[PDB]
Write a protein that binds this DNA or RNA. Structure first.
Ligand SMILES: [Zn+2]
Length: 141
DNA sequence: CACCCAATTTTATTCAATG
DNA sequence: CATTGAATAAAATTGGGTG
């Protein structure tokens, strides 16, 4: 329910801003609503990802996102740590937008990746941003 | 534990065709 | 003139392995 609450909140935002994105503004009511549902559900799923997400935990740092910087340790006289190189300091892998793209092709079969990049992905990215911007949208819920 | 690197995937962009 | 899509290169990630 908290998940459904968050998704509906995102969906209201998405409907509000949908007019600004050529790939969705043109879509018919029901198809448009389903495309927005896909985009919001995937954006929220990505926002909620962590090292506890099955399969996501970085293999090299085991989720800490940290690793000793041996060159700096040797030249600075103390143990210095850097961001883990494999996960770029996150500790876990993200869900690429390509997953939402493939999900959306089930509703827009002729959607190509370049046209997705130009005309639909910006809405997806905006929904991810909105997840980060809204405190009420919880990453642990 | 942190690294290496080929293989693979993601991503935006070039260039030519469309309309 | 804007838009699109095949192709492509840069960047990100994965798989298999090591010192
Ligand atoms: Zn890591």
């Amino acid at each position: 329910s908290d998940k459904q609450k968050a998704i509906n909140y995102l969906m209201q935002f998405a409907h509000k801003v949908s007019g600004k994105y050529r790939g969705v503004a043109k879509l018919e009511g029901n198809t448009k609503a389903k495309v927005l549902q896909v985009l919001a559900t995937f954006a929220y799923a990505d926002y909620c990802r962590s090292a506890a997400t099955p399969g996501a935990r970085c293999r090299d740092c085991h989720g800490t996102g940290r690793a000793v910087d041996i060159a700096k340790t040797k030249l600075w006289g103390r143990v210095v740590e850097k961001e883990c190189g494999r996960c770029k300091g996150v500790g876990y892998s993200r869900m690429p937008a390509s997953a939402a793209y493939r999900a959306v092709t089930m509703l827009i079969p002729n959607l190509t990746q370049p046209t997705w990049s130009r005309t639909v992905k910006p809405l997806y990215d905006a929904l991810v941003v909105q997840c980060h911007k809204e405190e009420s949208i919880a990453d642990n819920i």
